């Protein structure tokens, strides 16, 4: 009935194949402005009952209903003001109060912007009702933001073979991803154009990332009072560029910062959407934007927009983007196609990096860590961890702990690879409480309790390691290496490894290189102790060392790497 672009047809066939094999929810990740209409339309033409396309934000419900009807097709909509024509568009709130109009056959429920499912209960009543009437209802998610630092991933298994979320994830599966790179290369989105060399810039290279990878509004604002002589320099330039631009989106750091940005722009050539703005004015600014009444839209929570207006051609980033995902999401808000649009201008006034095409690690950043690719010695899967690569381009250090690949067997059994880059014992994860299977389902002993126990023996030494030093020598049975661990206040303890026999070399790889290496999975290459001595920028020292007394000298019995306590 309709002609689909190839990526749309792949989205459809992905969905159909999945639900032909599986009952479980699945999500699809197409970028913003991908043309969902045809995906929904063809799935609906194939659907047996009716199809419910749900969304939490009214403006999106209306835009989806509109783009679908412009196909020459008919749909009902439920928001705040016809004929069941086999697709129904609805808001979460409007649907949870009209269930008796949704009691016929529904085969599929598409949730647009499904990352919003997390942020509550009206939606779950909706889903309890549809699953009550339709036990085999199939649920499909659409999102441009499957990940947010602080919230993790919307799904667990990616169909390319990488695990993202855990068992707690909402969608078990992501069954198709449309990459921004492909949309841009094939003119499916507006090509972006970022100005390499700007006027003055912010310097947020001084703030502390929190636990969840995000900075804080208080930490953002303190720093934004010491650079707030620089702020009108930006807006001025922003204003300059907006002479030959139609719509301009400013991404501010905090609520207070946003009001500043607004108070430096032409009075009501600019508007301000904050997380706490009435939805009588937020929607009036919605409609005044879209229309080109004002020129500047100042926002603060991003991922709070349907104001992706097609006419928008200037994105102003005045805030450091913690995840590359946040960066692509913000830029993408101005990449929709529009008549006359040749490019979208990207002005970033923080110290953000460039690649729209960057692999999203999925866990928080040291500030200076870049993605690194690491192959799994077990399954071969190309992994994306945080690391430091050298000027040339090879690995100084990487920070991953487990292979993220997964695989499916004959009998439908799906397993994540067990290879561990950082292990703990005879080899559950660095933060395992109980062994899966050895010292044996035993309770593992928390490094902190161990530390305190060793401090409660005055026959044991406990060094808070701050460095180590290597030395080698030989005698009638071969070479040997001697490592010496020291306190930042004097104390020594040392161990020594013969390197002569093959069993010696093997023990030394097991017990020294594999715990001490900075690039686990990539083998250190050595023939004698001099090669080890030459490479100790690839080796790390333990955070703690526990020695005991043999007879008359201290003997190492424990090292604690990758520490995470208060001791």
Residue 513 DSSP label: I
CA distance linking residue 399 with residue 406, whole number of Å = 20
492: nearest Cα among 474, 517, 471 = 471
Cβ at position 375, least distance to Zn ion in Å: 9
Cβ at position 405, least distance to Zn ion in Å: 4
Cβ at position 380, least distance to Zn ion in Å: 7
Which residues contribute to the annotated binding site?
A: 376, 379, 403, 417
CA distance linking residue 296 with residue 337, whole number of Å = 19
Cβ at position 407, least distance to Zn ion in Å: 9
Nearest-5° Cα angle at 354, 353 to 355 = 120
Nearer to Zn ion, 240 or 415 (CB): 415
Contacts for 28 with CB less than 8 Å, ≥ 6 apart: 11, 14, 15, 39, 140, 141, 142, 143, 174, 175, 176, 177, 178
Run of H or E including 11? helix 6-21
Is the separation of the CB atoms in 355 and 180 below 8 Å? no
Q: Which residues bind Zn ion (CB under 5 A)?
A: 376, 378-379, 381, 403, 405, 417, 419
The whole-angstrom distance between residue 358's C-alpha and the CA centroid of its chain comes to 11
387: nearest Cα among 403, 371, 402, 401 = 371
Nearer to Zn ion, 96 or 382 (CB): 382
Cβ at position 386, least distance to Zn ion in Å: 18
Q: Annotate 536-561 with DSSP letters as a single string.
A: TTSB---SEEEEEESSSSEEEEEEE-
Identify the bridge partners of residue 51 per DSSP, sorted by sequence position: 87, 108
Which residues contribute to the annotated binding site for Zn(2+)?
A: 376, 379, 403, 417
Nearer to Zn ion, 105 or 415 (CB): 415
Positive or negative: CA dihedral 35, 40, 43, 45? negative
Nearer to Zn ion, 381 or 385 (CB): 381
Nearer to Zn ion, 337 or 378 (CB): 378
Nearer to Zn ion, 379 or 470 (CB): 379
Nearest-5° Cα angle at 318, 61 to 299 = 30
Cβ at position 418, least distance to Zn ion in Å: 8
Nearer to Zn ion, 381 or 508 (CB): 381
CA distance linking residue 517 with residue 541, whole number of Å = 9
Contacts for 499 with CB less than 8 Å, ≥ 6 apart: 472, 478, 479, 480, 481, 505, 508, 528, 529
Residue 340 DSSP label: T
Cβ at position 419, least distance to Zn ion in Å: 4
Nearer to Zn ion, 31 or 362 (CB): 362
Cβ at position 420, least distance to Zn ion in Å: 9
């Amino acid at each position: 009935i309709f002609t689909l672009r190839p990526y749309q047809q792949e989205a459809v066939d992905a969905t159909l194949n999945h639900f032909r094999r599986h009952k479980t929810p699945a999500v699809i990740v197409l970028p913003t402005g991908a043309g969902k209409s045809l995906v929904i339309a063809e799935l609906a033409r194939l659907a047996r009952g009716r199809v419910l396309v749900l969304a939490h934000v009214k403006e999106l419900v209306a835009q989806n209903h509109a783009k679908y009807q412009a196909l020459g097709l008919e749909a009902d909509i439920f928001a705040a003001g016809e004929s069941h024509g086999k697709v129904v568009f609805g808001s979460v709130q409007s649907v949870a109060r009209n269930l008796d109009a949704f009691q016929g056959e529904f085969s599929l429920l598409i949730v647009d912007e499904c990352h919003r499912i997390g942020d509550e209960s009206q939606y779950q009543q909706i889903l309890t009702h549809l699953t009550k009437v339709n036990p085999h209802l199939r649920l499909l998610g659409l999102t441009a933001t499957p990940f947010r630092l602080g919230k993790g991933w919307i799904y667990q298994f990616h169909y390319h073979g990488m695990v993202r979320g855990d068992e707690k994830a909402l969608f078990r599966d992501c069954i198709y991803e449309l990459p921004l790179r492909y949309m841009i290369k094939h003119g499916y989105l507006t090509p972006p154009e970022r100005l390499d060399m700007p006027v003055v810039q912010y310097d947020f290279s001084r703030l502390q990332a929190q636990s969840n990878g995000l900075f804080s509004e208080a930490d953002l604002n303190r720093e934004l009072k010491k650079q707030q002589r620089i702020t009108p320099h930006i807006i001025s330039q922003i204003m300059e560029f907006a002479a030959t631009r139609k719509g301009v989106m400013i991404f501010a750091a905090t609520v207070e910062h946003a009001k500043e940005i607004v108070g430096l722009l032409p009075a009501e050539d600019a508007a301000l959407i904050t997380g706490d703005t009435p939805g009588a004015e937020r929607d009036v600014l919605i409609e005044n934007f879209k229309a080109q009444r004002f020129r500047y839209l100042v926002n603060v929570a991003v991922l709070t927009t349907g104001f992706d207006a097609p006419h928008v051609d200037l994105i102003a980033i005045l805030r450091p983007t913690e995840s590359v995902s946040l960066y692509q999401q913000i830029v993408g808000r101005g990449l929709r196609l529009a008549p006359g649009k040749t490019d979208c201008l990207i002005l970033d006034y923080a110290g953000n990096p460039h690649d729209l095409y960057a692999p999203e690690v999925g866990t928080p950043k040291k500030s200076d860590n870049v993605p690194v690719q690491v192959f799994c010695p077990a399954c071969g899967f190309a992994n994306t961890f945080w690391g430091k690569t050298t000027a040339d381009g090879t690995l100084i250090e990487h920070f991953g702990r487990r292979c993220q690949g997964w695989f499916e067997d004959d009998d439908g059994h799906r397993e994540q690879c067990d290879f561990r880059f950082r292990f703990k014992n005879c080899q559950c994860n660095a933060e395992n409480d109980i062994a899966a299977r050895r010292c044996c389902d035993t309770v593992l002993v928390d490094p902190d309790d161990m530390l305190k126990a060793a401090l409660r023996l005055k026959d044991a030494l406990v060094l808070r390691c701050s460095g180590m030093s290597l030395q080698h020598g030989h005698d009638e049975k071969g070479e040997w290496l001697k490592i010496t661990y020291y306190d930042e206040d004097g104390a020594d303890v040392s161990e020594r490894f013969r390197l002569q026999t093959p069993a010696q070399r093997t023990a030394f790889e097991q017990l020294f290189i594999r715990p001490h290496t900075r690039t686990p999975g990539i083998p250190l290459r050595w023939i004698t102790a001099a090669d080890i001595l030459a490479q100790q920028a690839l080796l790390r020292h333990p955070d703690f060392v526990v020695a005991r007394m043999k007879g008359q000298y201290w003997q190492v019995r424990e090292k604690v790497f990758d520490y995470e306590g208060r001791f």
